[PDB]
Amino acid sequence: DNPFYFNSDNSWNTLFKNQYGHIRVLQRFDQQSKRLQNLEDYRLVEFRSKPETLLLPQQADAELLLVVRSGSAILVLVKPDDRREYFFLTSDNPIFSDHQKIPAGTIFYLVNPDPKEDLRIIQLAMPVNNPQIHEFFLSSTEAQQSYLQEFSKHILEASFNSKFEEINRVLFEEEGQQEGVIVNIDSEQIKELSKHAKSSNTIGNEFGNLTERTDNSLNVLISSIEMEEGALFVPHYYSKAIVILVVNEGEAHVELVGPKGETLEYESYRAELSKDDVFVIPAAYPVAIKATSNVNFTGFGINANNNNRNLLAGKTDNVISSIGRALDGKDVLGLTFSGSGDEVMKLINKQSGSYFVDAH
Amino acid sequence: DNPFYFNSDNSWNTLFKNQYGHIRVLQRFDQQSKRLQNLEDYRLVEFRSKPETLLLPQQADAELLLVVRSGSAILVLVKPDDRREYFFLTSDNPIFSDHQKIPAGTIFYLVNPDPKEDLRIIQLAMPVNNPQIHEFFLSSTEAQQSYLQEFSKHILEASFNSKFEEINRVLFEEEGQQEGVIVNIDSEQIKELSKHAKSSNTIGNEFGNLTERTDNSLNVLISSIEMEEGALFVPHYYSKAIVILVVNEGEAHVELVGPKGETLEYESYRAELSKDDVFVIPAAYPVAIKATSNVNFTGFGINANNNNRNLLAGKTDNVISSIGRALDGKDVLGLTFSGSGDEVMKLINKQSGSYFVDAH
Amino acid sequence: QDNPFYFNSDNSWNTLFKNQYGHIRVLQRFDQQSKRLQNLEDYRLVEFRSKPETLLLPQQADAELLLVVRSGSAILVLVKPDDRREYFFLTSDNPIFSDHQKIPAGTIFYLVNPDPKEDLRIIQLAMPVNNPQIHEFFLSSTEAQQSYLQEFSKHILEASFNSKFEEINRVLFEEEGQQEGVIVNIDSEQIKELSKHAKSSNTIGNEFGNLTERTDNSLNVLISSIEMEEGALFVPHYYSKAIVILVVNEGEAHVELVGPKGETLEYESYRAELSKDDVFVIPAAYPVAIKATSNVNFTGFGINANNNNRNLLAGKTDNVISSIGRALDGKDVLGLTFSGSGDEVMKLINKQSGSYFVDAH
């Protein structure tokens, strides 16, 4: 049992699915292991839809950080005081962004504008009430009942100022209802939206690339890691951030050194990652990742404010060289390892690359 | 059973009670049910006093947010470096405030200076040490010993520089101690205290009124609610604040919608409310309140900074009308409900009311 | 069980490492002792000791540390990945250098005991990031422990270092050349350059005792130091909001804490006889008194300290009871509170001319 590896064949839970797309939530982290109890308050939600579709109005009881891991998207957030907000999200093109935070209980709807590409979304959610994520759909479809349908009849009459039959016909009539929450929209309607919506760094080399961005407000960090077959992300550790990794495409070998099960005895937690798999990396635990195929991930780092990336090989951000460069440093290295301070520095300098190495 | 309902008849517990007043504490929220886990840190204290009384000095291990739900009170804070803070609180006259935060561990005493009216107080507590709330009384009365009496004879003689017998005669002697912590005081005493003390937005209509106040630093809000008999507070929800309702006087019928037991299936949680009953309205969960008689509530909303009030019926703060005014609002609403967008838009317009409605 | 706030050194510390040169101990979890101590689930104490002229090999831990020197001197160096370093000289008593420093989570660091005759005693508060356990990753390869480097695959180490595993093993891990442990002995001459640059980079008390506190506003934690003459008393008092953790550095003391019987209006006295390395917890707003039974010195940490206030129940300074007496109605109020009359109690409160610390022989 590698308690930090979440296989896709078990970890995700289908919430919705139809010919046009699907929604799944990842299982509680702390339920998998108590060693992951500081991740109790965080949950993952994944979404996928075919071209030209619309996700109907809803509001969830969690703070969402929506990331587009493929395609484009039109997001419109609706405010109770007659105000609206539009955002055009695209995973690549440097003109538009690929993430947007959505405040708890804010009604929003999503559109996949492209006629060819699918919208692939991954999001960090942070529930308000208790650790479970609750989505309140306003729609009445074949798949689900609208929440207004839960209140009592005269409460509905007295509110809307109409007779139930009128209110029902216009709102709830089984006839006329759409099938599910992911609906197929028409090309004409969305050109108008897209237009208005549209009006509104990296470290890598031959073998890989790494792009991170930190949201000081949420105290969260968002990465993008691309690696080509045979590449290697040399051993390293993130000082303060807890890192949640997700395979978007590809497969890779992961090696994590954690505590053996409060001692000075280690143990390795090796795993073989593939599409939709999620791997957790605790703050300060060393890790190395090698591309078994071309692979790209998206990661969320929690506790991101003032985090340092410490590398254990290569020319850039190497802490061992740094130790060797302290005032009486070489003497420290010679006592740390079996060689001499000179010998270790010699070895530490053989490698000419930084971050992403070739491992074959 | 409804996990959000706290029946006064069996949810409060008496700390102290005597011919002049009482103090009871509400049971733990997370104990009634795990759904209520993000409330494990808060508590509700209730206290009522007869006219012209004093609550003897004490300090508690919790932050208090005190609220006059009926009557008037003279609150005084005693700081160690020869300082006091005098506050005059009342429920109705717009000249004085109706609430006051009391920092943890601060010595304070209370007075009901009125010669005819009783004092009714409701307060939100945030214990510092663990889930329990601890009150340390300085007083020595027939109902309780002073905490000073838990110290050893030699610690006491040394501290005060007096033989244990002097100390006993002045501070603890049985003959002279009041009967309990609530005390009957004379009108002439509270005369000069009143002077000294006194020198130191609403939405509604004929059917009911709502008055809300947000304490930015505490990130908590207080709501006062009065609805005439037969009035309805139409279906609404709050984006992020989890709400705790308390009935001060009167009767009401409530319906809250939420998750049936992580899915899309809902459930209705209804309840018939009366005095001192408590009801938890989770953030983002739709709710409606129908007044069975003339009723007055007091509410505490926690995790309130930036919370929004989403209404589902009427002229003010209606989300549904706002979705209609979006770019292709009508088309979205069209796909959201059975009716066309023009139809549901016209429907939403029949109710001229806002917030409170006639439902006699 | 009996007294949930007392932690006997004998059965409360677990040894992480120990050898001829020094040792590292970790205190048992606060919550694991008593459910009453719930709000300290995420806090820990680590204790360390060193012989004169010793070095503690590099390591990074997954906890934010607040290091405090309880005796001796130390040179602390923090190593950053961007070719940057931070040097600190720490001492316990001479008012010229600091006695404490905070080490952020995941920062590589190493400590030296420059002194040729004195030991180095450190007490430290830890706030773990991952879960309640505190983990320490040692970079070193010694008879005692292997380096976390040794835990990756040979081929990954080869690709990483661009070296054949035989040379990688030679130069780094060969046991035919490693030290016996993580606390190692050094030469005064070796640290010649270091020490130089290191060295180049609130009290209320009387004849009976001295209190010295400081508050790291960023961390919302308070640091106290108490010294008391044998036979002295820190009269009854309480902290309004801070939860205080007390550690006996040297000496013996008698403590009396007044808490609840288990929400009643019934109190109960929790008492103990403290001595070297015992930890005693003092909850926010719970009354307490300490009688020094031998010359004694304490170091304590105060969590949830921003805005805290000290309330004494006896003495001429910070006396809350006299402060009630001087209120617009005070005397009337004090007369109903206690058995005697307001003038009578007010008379008694003034017999004690001392403040904070009092003679109790």
Ligand SMILES: *[C@@H]1O[C@H](CO)[C@@H](O)[C@H](O)[C@H]1NC(C)=O
């Ligand atoms: C990332 O990797 C590719 C392939 O090695 C390289 O051409 C590219 O310049 C790198 N950086 C960016 C920003 O694409």
Ligand SMILES: *[C@@H]1O[C@H](CO)[C@@H](O)[C@H](O)[C@H]1NC(C)=O
């Ligand atoms: C406020 O609410 C009460 C209760 O329904 C109502 O009777 C009263 O007319 C309202 N009036 C004003 C001025 O707010």
Ligand SMILES: *[C@@H]1O[C@H](CO)[C@@H](O)[C@H](O)[C@H]1NC(C)=O
């Ligand atoms: C502090 O307390 C000590 C120890 O009890 C006392 O002897 C000393 O003189 C006090 N004052 C100063 C300045 O140290």
